[PDB]
Amino acid sequence: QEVKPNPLQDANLCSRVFFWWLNPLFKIGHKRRLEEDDMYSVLPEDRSQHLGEELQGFWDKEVLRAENDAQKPSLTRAIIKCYWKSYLVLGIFTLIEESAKVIQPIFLGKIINYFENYDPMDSVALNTAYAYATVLTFCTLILAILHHLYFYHVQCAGMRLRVAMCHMIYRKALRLSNMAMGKTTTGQIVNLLSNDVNKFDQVTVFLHFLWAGPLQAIAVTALLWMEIGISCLAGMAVLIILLPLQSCFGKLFSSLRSKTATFTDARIRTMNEVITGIRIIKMYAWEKSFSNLITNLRKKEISKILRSSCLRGMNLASFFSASKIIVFVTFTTYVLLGSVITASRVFVAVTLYGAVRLTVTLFFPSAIERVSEAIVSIRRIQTFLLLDEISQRNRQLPSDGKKMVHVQDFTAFWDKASETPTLQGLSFTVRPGELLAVVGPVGAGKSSLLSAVLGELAPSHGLVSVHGRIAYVSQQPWVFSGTLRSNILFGKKYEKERYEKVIKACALKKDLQLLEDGDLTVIGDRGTTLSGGQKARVNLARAVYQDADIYLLDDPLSAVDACVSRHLFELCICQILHEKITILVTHQLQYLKAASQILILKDGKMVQKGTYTEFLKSGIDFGSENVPVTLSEENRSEGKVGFQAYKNYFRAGAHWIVFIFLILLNTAAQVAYVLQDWWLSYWANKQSMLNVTVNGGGNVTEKLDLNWYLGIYSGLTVATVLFGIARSLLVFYVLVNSSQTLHNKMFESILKAPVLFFDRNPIGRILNRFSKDIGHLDDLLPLTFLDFIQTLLQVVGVVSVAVAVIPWIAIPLVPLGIIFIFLRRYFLETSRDVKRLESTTRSPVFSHLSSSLQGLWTIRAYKAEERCQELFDAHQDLHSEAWFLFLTTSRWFAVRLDAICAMFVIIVAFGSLILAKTLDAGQVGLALSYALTLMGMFQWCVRQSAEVENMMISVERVIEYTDLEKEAPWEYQKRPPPAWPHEGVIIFDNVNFMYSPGGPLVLKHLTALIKSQEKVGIVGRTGAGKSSLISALFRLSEPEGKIWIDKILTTEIGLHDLRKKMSIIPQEPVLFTGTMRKNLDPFNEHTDEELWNALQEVQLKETIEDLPGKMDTELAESGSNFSVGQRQLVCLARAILRKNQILIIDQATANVDPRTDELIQKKIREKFAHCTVLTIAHRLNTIIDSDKIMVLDSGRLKEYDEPYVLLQNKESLFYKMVQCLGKAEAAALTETAKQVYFKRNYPHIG
Ligand SMILES: Nc1ncnc2c1ncn2[C@@H]1O[C@H](COP(=O)(O)OP(=O)(O)OP(=O)(O)O)[C@@H](O)[C@H]1O
Ligand SMILES: Nc1ncnc2c1ncn2[C@@H]1O[C@H](COP(=O)(O)OP(=O)(O)OP(=O)(O)O)[C@@H](O)[C@H]1O
Ligand SMILES: [Mg+2]
Ligand SMILES: [Mg+2]
């Protein structure tokens, strides 16, 4: 699958300058659409691993020199020391080009001097005119040929720098410790890799012009001084009064960029709690809660960028304002001093200014802004690089060949600001062949003991020793993108004789046989495709298949069915891991009979540590075609999209009256700019005629109205300046408003998407369009729209000025125009698909980064950092190839445009003499300079239009999401009564649920009756449909059959109205980043009294009050500070505070100790004893006292009756399941069920 080599490496200079190696690519793109197998590979020196590892050495040398100097490090010094060698050589080309751009007007003015004094006698004049023509061609060739190659090399260097910085940021994020994890979130890294690197490839382009500005300005001032006297110093004064203002604007630009960045960080941080928990938001109708925050943050960000956009508009208006400013300046003095201008002074002035402005007034403020943004970018990258790194594992001592884990007197602190430690007095050891059992209450430190073995917890007192590889199993399963086989292997080689044994031991055979593809089906991100019980066993199978030496199982039997839990514990831990080192932690009091070492931890204090018989003897107790991968690329059909997107983009900004006032002001500014030069030429001609008539017998002396002329010129100039300023401000404001409206519409439409979209499209595919695709509309879109509208206006003005001349020069404008149109049409048909492929290849970078930033724990546990870095480098090169191809195509188009313009100039200069041998200056003279200005404006306008089309097809990616077909509306026309549900009777009648249209069936003929105020329990093997039934009830996807709730069909009411009447406890734990008050209730409607009452009921306030800011503690990403027990308690508190009629418990006692479990069960039974509670759990000790228990097997309901009736039948699946888990527990459960049945049936004798 190796892509063909890039023909650039096998090309000479003659084909590299003109980009001749792009003919087959364009010929292929013109016929069919481009694919990923048609993009050329990057050079061997432009790889990600070759640049990142090269810059890392320089960064390490710089930080070592800073540590030796005992000062603060800096990234700019290392960047310079690394990228100055391959960049100082490019300065000589700019130095010679800026000199040629000043030399060219000299010859342009000298060649016209011959036509001004045309004589048919002397041939030396013709000889020197031809020599001037030859040197003019010599200068224009080097000015218009190598400039695009220099731009291409600069863009390549910028892309290399961006790739190196991205690799460095990724390598830094792959080593962040737990302390640094609480200061930064995923949104920060997303922003740093999306927008903070988009300025490096742009700031390295304009610094040359930045430092060459004054050098060319002084040169052109000294050149003008040769003809103009002391009066020319006013122009230098204007320059030295304008440039310091542009330099001082850098501080304001830096402050505005810093504010934009610190706000965009918080704006992007609120993405995981919106997307990854879309089911939790839909099950609680909290979409408006997140919309009240995200749109407000976007409005604040827009208000902050308003000042930056106003400054950019002011600079872009000053760009074309300073030209006429400098025209008026020194001319107000040369006219008032008595001297006059007829043709020569004004002509040389305009011909010099036309070349000076394009650099000085354009690239200087742009370069200032680019440097101001790059400073903030480098500062943020350095701040991210100076975070607290993870404690690297020290060099282990040479052992005697054996492996063991020894911990003696361990003491560490999770948070240095806290007063109490997490662990106290740890002294134990594990040998190969033993079984350690950790038991304790909630929030005691059971998982901290396992985390300390890995190396994530810095030991504050003591020493640890780890000999051998570790296979860690996190409490929360982590499944990345890919098939189940790739998830089990995880870099290991496929071995059927061991894979089948691992599948049989983990009881995954039924799961692989019930699916449609077995172990070859794809799995979405975050394991949204599979269930919790399936991922909990997939992770264990992956850990077992690795064949490691240390197995740190962090409660893998918490979300697994009780019937298969015994089989798993018997055929995966006591048989496979019997010879290895393992530390199993759990809450069940039946698996500890086979363990030889039990550590009863309590609040991080080692109370007891012995065997299982020592606790019973002493008397102490401890219980008190093949489903392609993730819906590959589907963005196609980019066949010259029409005005359908342009109309929407123009209407989302302002009203039609504002849209027409915009073009009115644009044409007014253009006609004023034209009339300025028109009046200047008229005054010059009038002064020439006056000098002629006063030299040829000037009997009368009638001087022109000096005051009137000066006043009208100043008025025209001021009007033009004000019109330009106003139109720039209006355009920028309209474009900012349009971008904000488009972003708001996209955000409002995304929330209304079905649950299938979120788990069929990867996180990266919908995250890269919320930071880069929508962030470009604030950084590149208006700067490209206004730089093209003004260019088109200037082209129209130049054409209207030139049409007033003999059409002998305007006739050949039609073939040139149609050739340019054909070239633009041929180049866009390729550039569109090239940009599409660039976006499609940049998407997987973020798609993999989002999964890596969540699975870094398992990554460090398995030591797959090399594989992760290789995958990241491959994903980055996949996009760098398309970026290089886009840059090469743009440079080839520019080279072709410049070549055609030079050919047209040569033609109009050569083929005109045969007919103008007699036609002198005034009618043939200065026409060459006219044509040069015309071709320059054309070359600028074509590139501007190409860039605008590129930006339009880029924003088309956002515009496409305007429809985003949805499910049933929020509220239908028929509304339920305000007292509904009054009873809560749910009736099913042949209901079927399918996660995808045409997919495998889950619920097959499910019929059950649920009375009012009847506690119904649901049990059965995992992955059977226990959650599918809840999903069909909550209407996450359109089900079959009919579902009646209090004589009301679910398919005839509003989705939000149905979801707001049923509370639910989520199966997986998830918390929102923010304050505890907002996490408990974001609407801010609950009183503190009832909040504390609910906290006391949940039994969490006792430890909540320990923190100083009980209601102000800001949580980390996904609740990194809180544990699984704390997350479950917060979810229970939220469900209690909901206080609705219908309550559905899915998974509430997964990782809960038996004591607090029974406590909260009794509390719930006392509180909600007057409503219908649909509780679901694996442990029967909390549901054996229910009214009826459902038995879901393979989707179909096998039996549904009373628990005692099920126990009285030795053939029932419920009895066959409860027969396991020992004998005493089963007997106690049967006795409790019999007592409950007696008390319910015969109270007269019970
Ligand atoms: N990043 C963190 N910063 C500060 N404290 C933390 C962090 N992570 C966990 N904790 C603390 O550790 C405690 C939980 O410890 P640990 O994870 O070792 O046991 P556990 O597995 O949660 O116990 P159980 O399984 O009974 O819930 C929590 O009370 C929490 O306050
Ligand atoms: N988006 C999806 N695409 C394909 N299949 C899916 C999707 N969502 C769920 N499934 C399948 O539907 C089944 C539903 O299982 P369910 O979630 O009811 O298990 P569970 O009862 O939650 O397990 P446990 O009781 O251990 O938590 C899963 O086995 C899964 O394979
Ligand atoms: Mg735990
Ligand atoms: Mg479930």
Numbering used by the authors: 6 to 629, 680 to 1301
From the paper:
Human multidrug resistance protein 4 (hMRP4, also known as ABCC4), with a representative topology of the MRP subfamily, translocates various substrates across the membrane and contributes to the development of multidrug resistance. Moreover, hMRP4 transports various endogenous signaling molecules, including cyclic nucleotides, folic acid, eicosanoids, urate, prostaglandins, leukotrienes, and conjugated steroids. Unlike bMRP1, which contains an extra transmembrane domain (TMD) denoted as TMD0, hMRP4 presents a typical ABC transporter structure with two TMDs (TMD1 and TMD2) and two nucleotide-binding domains (NBDs; NBD1 and NBD2). Here, we captured four distinct states of hMRP4 along the ATP-driven transport cycle, including the apo inward-open (no substrate or ATP), substrate-bound inward-open (no ATP), inhibitor-bound inward-open (no ATP) and ATP-bound outward-open (no substrate, but ATP-Mg2+) states.
Therefore, to collect sufficient NBD-dimerized hMRP4 particles for 3D EM reconstruction, besides the engineered EQ mutation, we also introduced two cysteine mutations in each NBD (E568C and Q1275C) to stabilize the dimerized NBDs of hMRP4 and added 2 mM ATP-Mg2+ in the whole hMRP4 purification process. However, the EM density corresponding to the disulfide bond was not observed in the ATP-bound hMRP4 map, indicating the dimerized NBDs were mainly stabilized by the binding of ATP molecules, as has been reported for other ATP-bound ABC transporters. We found that a majority of particles adopted a closed NBD conformation based on two-dimensional (2D) class averages. We obtained a well-defined three-dimensional (3D) electron microscopy map with an overall resolution of ~3.5 Å, enabling us to build the atomic model for most regions of hMRP4. The structural comparison revealed that the structure of the ATP-bound hMRP4 presented a conformation resembling that of the outward-open ATP-bound bMRP1 and ABCD1 rather than the outward-occluded human SUR1 and ABCB6 (hSUR1). The hydrated cavity in the ATP-bound hMRP4 structure was exposed to the solvent and open to the outer leaflet, thus indicating that the ATP-bound structure we solved is likely in an outward-open state. The ATP binding induced the patching of TMDs by forming extensive contacts between the two halves of the transporter along the entire vertical axis. As a result, an obvious outward-open cavity was created by the curvature of the TMs, forming a substrate-releasing site. As expected, the NBDs formed a pseudo-symmetric “head-to-tail” dimer through the binding of ATP molecules, which were well-solved in the EM map, displaying clear densities corresponding to ATP and Mg2+.
